[PDB]
Amino acid sequence: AEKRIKVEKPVVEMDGDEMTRIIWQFIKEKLILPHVDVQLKYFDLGLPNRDQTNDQVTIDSALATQKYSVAVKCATITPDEARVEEFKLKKMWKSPNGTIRNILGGTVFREPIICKNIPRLVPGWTKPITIGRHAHGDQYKATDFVVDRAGTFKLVFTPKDGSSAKEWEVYNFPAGGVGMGMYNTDESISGFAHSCFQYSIQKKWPLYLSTKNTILKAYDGRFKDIFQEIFDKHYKTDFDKNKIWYEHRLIDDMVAQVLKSSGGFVWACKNYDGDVQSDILAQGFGSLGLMTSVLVCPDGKTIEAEAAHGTVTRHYREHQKGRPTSTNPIASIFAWTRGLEHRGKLDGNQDLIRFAQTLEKVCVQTVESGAMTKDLAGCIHGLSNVKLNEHFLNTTDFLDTIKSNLDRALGKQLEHH
Amino acid sequence: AEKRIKVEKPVVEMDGDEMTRIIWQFIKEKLILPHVDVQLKYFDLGLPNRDQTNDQVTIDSALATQKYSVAVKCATITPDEARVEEFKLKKMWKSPNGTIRNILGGTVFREPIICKNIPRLVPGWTKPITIGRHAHGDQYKATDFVVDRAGTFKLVFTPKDGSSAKEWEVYNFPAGGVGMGMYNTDESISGFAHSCFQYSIQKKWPLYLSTKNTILKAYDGRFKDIFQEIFDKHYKTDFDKNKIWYEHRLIDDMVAQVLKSSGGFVWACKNYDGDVQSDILAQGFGSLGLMTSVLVCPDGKTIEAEAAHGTVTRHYREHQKGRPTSTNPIASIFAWTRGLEHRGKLDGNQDLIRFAQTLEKVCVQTVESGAMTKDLAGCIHGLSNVKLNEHFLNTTDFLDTIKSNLDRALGKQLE
Ligand SMILES: [Mg+2]
Ligand SMILES: [Mg+2]
């Protein structure tokens, strides 16, 4: 290609774990840095460094993302019991996404990456669906415990001004059990709502906020109340103007509608439902690998693009020994592209935005032309009916095909001006 | 059946609301009692009577279910803001299904009804899938509240044996917000697990418990642990004998893995997940109306077979104005059959069991042959390519067709 595109402001990079960390490197080397001059603020969120720093690098990386307004994040391991044994960890550390999302706040938007030849497990979904997952609070900022004896679990609220304290007896445990408490601010639900309406306007689509307000009257009612209050006060005229609507729905009614519908709408979820229902969407549209994830913070400027799927552990065992693999890198690629795309919007850099979009176009077209990794070929032909270099190809070979197609596609650009 | 089938012990009947209430008494009058002599213990759980009794009749029906060990429940209204204006209720009463499940406890087993002519929205699922929803606790017995000003929200556990009281600060509120707290006992999780393992063995299918124990390490971890403890102590040897397995899984891995698979397993969900994921299975397998729902208590004897779908109001307004409707009653019929089928198995009554099966086989065959309601027609032809008395029948007509086919099927049996 020509001279590299000069990016004025920096971009935070959060490095990942095991096999997603290796393809992360090959993406920077072959696709990003050859075409883009960018100042990269590095943070290693790999599990070894998190252990060494005591999960402090996770906090510092989030604070850096607040400062420079853009981050890109590779996939990381949230450690279980076996991982503490393997990595010799001093503590079973909490989810780094949880720590970051709590600090930044806002709304995780998730939508599928549409490859026209990839078959859908849900034939009904002709148009694409976007989830707006609430990034803060609920189960991901909870306080849970085990009860080993008889006792009285209660909630207590002590006002700051000094008026008398309120109390609620949750349960008198007769013997052993478990208990937990969670929360959410009005502020975070407001910023969550603003994000979902504004995205619903920009997309020219309707919005649906699912809750379970019939059971949790005070808690889930506050979601429905704040959404309806903001809709009718700010975006009522704009939805009517654009031939679209906002509605609430019951969560168990909603998941039936979605599976039955043709699609083509925004779907606002609470924190927990966003996690569960977005992995249904992804898999229904074709594959877990084909999905984006962009945490849009309430301030309007800040984002954290990231790899949707988890780390590929079994494929990492092969790369240690020096053997080939076939791991789909497209999620990691799109995390980079959406990071640069938003970097460009913030600075008015038109070349950077068009580069990002061109790379997204290429990744799709490459798969559409029958060049793909094993997991995507398994969607088409069946998982045990595919040969090496015939139906699918290796991970670095697939990246080399994208590298090649990117240069070709960038060749058709500028030459016609 | 010139003489009816006698039933030694009683059955509890919980009457419902609006349109299902109408088709409930249709089923009682012309489908059940003509062929079965069964002493029913009537409890009206309609919303007007629940207001009359301060939701006490709801409790009374549960205590009756404990005594006689079988219940059948029509669909009821969980009232919202709009219902308190309409019915002029004194208080916005809580869910009667919530109140009953809390008192009885156990595992709500939900599985689809397979009609071969109905298409599935998930082509992958060749074989059927049974969810085992946990009946008790979690969000359904939660204390939740709104926060109007700044303050410190904390939890407190005060041991009864006089040991040290523990406290956890949850959050220090700057502005307003919301907070809640919930619980679950170890005994509830045991009976839940046992019920799931016994059903998984009797089906000869593998079991999968799903949790989010990476995040809620203590709470969801307790489920993972108790299931695994009970498996290895009691059931591992019988699972191995029938070529089946138990496995834990992460919830967001499970929902992907289920949709990808071709079914044929038992899926043990927690209380909240079972509510949501059962509607995905139902809708995906064909339609919300083609779903059974049987609460199976920890003791093994007691059950409560309920109507899965809600009491759809759209159609009830047409009925009140004289016009015909097209609601699917098959759910409500299966509530009866599964009640009677269990009533028969408890008492050793082979005739009652055969009858219950015959009616289920009739409901399926009736749809498979061609006769069906509007919503089941819409699954095949689409919702706006359907003709009244061509592609579908009325609610009244459909029930008379089932009554006819039941009588002819029963009339063929005696030979
Ligand atoms: Mg996930
Ligand atoms: Mg439900």
Numbering used by the authors:
A (entry chain B): 40 to 456
B (entry chain A): 40 to 454
Question: What's written in the study?
Answer:
The isocitrate dehydrogenases (IDHs) compose a family of enzymes that catalyze the sequential dehydrogenation and decarboxylation of isocitrate to α-ketoglutarate (αKG) in the mitochondria or the cytosol. Hence, IDH2 plays an important role in reactive oxygen species (ROS) removal in the mitochondria or the prevention of age-related diseases. In this CR-mediated pathway, we have shown that mIDH2 activity was regulated by its acetylation/deacetylation state.
The two subunits share highly similar structures (root-mean-square deviation (RMSD) of 0.3 Å for the superposition of 826 Cα atoms). In each subunit, one isocitrate molecule and Mg2+ were similarly bound in the active site (isocitrate-binding pocket). A hydrophilic cleft is formed between the large domain and the small domain and serves as the active site where the isocitrate molecule and Mg2+ are bound. Arg residues (Arg140, Arg149 and Arg172) and Lys251 on one side stabilized the binding of negatively charged isocitrate, while Asp residues (Asp291, Asp314 and Asp318) on the other side stabilized the positively charged Mg2+ metal ion by electrostatic interactions. We note that because there are four positively charged lysine residues in the large domain, consisting of Lys127, Lys129, Lys130 and Lys133, those positively charged lysine residues might exert repulsion on Lys256 in the small domain, resulting in a wider cleft. In contrast, the corresponding distances in wild-type mIDH2 are both 4.2 Å, which are too distant to form hydrogen bonds.
